[PDB]
Paper text:
The Fc region of the immunoglobulin (IgG) antibody, which is the focus of this study, can have interactions with Fc gamma receptors (FcγR) and first subcomponent of the C1 complex (C1q) that mediate antibody-dependent cellular cytotoxicity (ADCC), complement-dependent cytotoxicity (CDC), antibody-dependent cellular phagocytosis (ADCP), induction of secretion of mediators, endocytosis of opsonized particles, as well as modulation of tissue and serum half-life through interaction with the neonatal Fc receptor (FcRn). We describe here the functional and structural characteristics of three novel silent Fc designs: huIgG1 sigma (IgG1σ), which is a variant of huIgG1, and huIgG4 sigma1 (IgG4σ1) and huIgG4 sigma2 (IgG4σ2), which are variants of huIgG4.
HuIgG1 and huIgG1σ differ at position 268 (histidine in huIgG1, alanine in huIgG1σ) in the BC loop, and at positions 330 (alanine in huIgG1, serine in huIgG1σ) and 331 (proline in huIgG1, serine in huIgG1σ) in the FG loop. A clash between P271 and K326 was avoided by a rigid body displacement rather than conformational flip of the FG loop away from the flipped BC loop. In addition to the deviation in conformations of the BC and FG loops for the huIgG1σ Fc, the structural studies suggest an increased mobility for these two loops that may play a direct role in how this Fc interacts with the FcγRs.
Numbering used by the authors:
A (entry chain A): 236 to 444
B (entry chain B): 235 to 444
The structure:
């Protein structure tokens, strides 16, 4: 079952902040109740490692079992482009199944962050859209958040990264707020974390002009 | 049993929304063996067999298999009214036929609101600047967005995929990049949006230096 095994990268924020602990996560589903202990082998740049913490089989709501293995990774290892391999050996199956993941290769490029106030035409509405354009970044791993008065905002959506014509990525984040909060002069801030920004962080603000 | 080797693709949104354009449904069969006899296609529209499809000759792939494509031209009205298109792929080498079906997304259509946004003040120090088109509140997600200036298509734009918003509708952004000099001259730029819930399937918003 080369499709019962899933390997997840660390969160973008986790690899960029010293206070956080990035992990790669190997998930195997559909283990039968009659199957023996599923084995995980982990490799970093081809070298086997043994510090993974594997979760005892958890019974599911569809009668199957799930096994999750978690490997903590070093911030710099991930950022320096090391390859993480997860190999899952379920003896009830013919074959072991391997997956590999790593940071995309290529010169990192610094995001340029721009905030855009609502379109004049939208000011007629009950709620208005505050836009954060983030462009020119590489690789596509990035975190974007909105806040106001030191507090996280409740209502925003961010597009996936989109490949631009010069080989870098862009995205937009759309924050929706009541027109009243906008008219009252509240300051809103889009913060962005990416490996190619100084301090891995930058913020741009937006308020009624 | 070959079931995962047949793929059925819808027409492009723009093609279904403009009568002058030709919308097509495309049935693609991959992993066709050289030892297989002729792959055969039958096509149906709401269960009724149709005969106007054009099937291309098999094309050799670098992995020693063939790809075979059949293309069915559809009426705009038919697609937009939700008729079902079925491609049935037959091959003596297989025990059973493989059938795939496709149709337009269901659910109440909602009209997009289109907003143009000028470059951020901070971007005006760059030699290239970004003109933004925000399109929101639409359903279904099938939509086309383009940019023009002086009646000519612009080259350098990219558009995000539709993103599901908190109310069940979709939004996207389209980003047009232009030389800062063209923006500063006062040239007018237009974002045009095609969607089935718009009057005449078309609307546009313009943007220039202010
Ligand atoms: C029996 O039950 C279990 C449990 O199911 C759950 O419970 C029931 C009640 C249902 O409600 C069900 O919906 C629930 O999911 C079933 O197990 C499930 O099995 C399916 C497959 O059958 C799995 O589906 C795949 O999911 C992938 C993504 O999963 C994530 O996102 C979904 C939501 O989108 C979540 O629900 C998942 O749990 C996953 O969530 C992610 O989890 C990560 C690990 O924890 C998180 O990362 C970590 O987070 C921590 C802290 O949070 C740290 O930060 C760590 O650092 C970090 O690593 C992550 O944040 C989290 N994300 C989110 C958003 O929450 C899909 O990607 C995948 O699609 C691929 O594969 C498909 C083939 O199956 C294919 O169709 C797709 O196209 C895609 O294909 C891939 O394409 C790429 C590139 O093109 C290729 O490179 C790949 O090769 C290719 N894939 C291939 C070849 O396989 C699947 O859709 C599902 O995840 C799983 N659930 C759980 C919980 O394990 C089981 O199936 C049931 N049996 C039945 C029904 O018979
Ligand atoms: C041997 O080789 C062949 C050929 O590959 C090529 O050669 C080899 C040697 C390599 O060099 C390789 O790199 C080359 O590409 C291999 O054939 C491939 O087989 C795989 C399957 O194994 C196919 O994978 C599916 O791809 C779908 C997307 O395909 C499009 O997008 C890719 C780019 O991302 C293109 O490469 C494709 O050609 C398709 O491109 C589209 O083509 C349309 C038809 O022409 C275009 O539409 C038309 O456009 C014209 C204009 O030109 C008009 O506008 C018409 O009106 C319009 O109709 C369209 O524009 C174009 N798009 C793009 C972006 O280019 C995926 O959708 C699909 O995913 C489904 O299936 C998976 C299961 O396999 C599943 O995991 C997914 O989740 C998803 O599941 C489906 O989900 C839907 C709903 O979401 C359900 O309804 C379905 O039921 C469900 N199906 C399931 C579960 O099965 C696959 O990933 C691949 O497309 C194909 N390549 C080619 C070129 O045909 C072959 O595999 C090799 N064999 C071996 C043994 O190695």
């Amino acid at each position: 079952g080369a499709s019962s095994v899933f390997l997840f990268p660390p969160k973008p924020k986790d690899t960029l902040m010293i206070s956080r602990t990035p992990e790669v996560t190997c998930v195997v589903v559909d283990v039968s109740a009659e199957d023996p202990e599923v084995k995980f082998n982990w490799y970093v740049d081809g070298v086997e490692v043994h510090n993974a913490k594997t979760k005892p089989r958890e019974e599911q709501y569809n009668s199957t079992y799930r096994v999750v293995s978690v490997l903590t990774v070093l911030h710099q290892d991930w950022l320096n482009g090391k390859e993480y391999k997860c190999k899952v050996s379920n003896k009830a199956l013919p074959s072991s199944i391997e997956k590999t993941i790593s940071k995309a290769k290529g010169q990192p490029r610094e995001p340029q962050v721009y905030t855009l106030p609502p379109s004049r035409d939208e000011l007629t509405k009950n709620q208005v859209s505050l836009t954060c354009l983030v462009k020119g970044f590489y690789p596509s791993d990035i975190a974007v958040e909105w806040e106001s008065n030191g507090q996280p905002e409740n209502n925003y959506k961010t597009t996936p990264p989109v490949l631009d014509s010069d080989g870098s990525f862009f995205l937009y984040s759309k924050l929706t707020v009541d027109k009243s909060r906008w008219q009252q002069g509240n300051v809103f801030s889009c913060s962005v974390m990416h490996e190619a920004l100084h301090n891995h962080y930058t913020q741009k603000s937006l308020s009624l002009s």
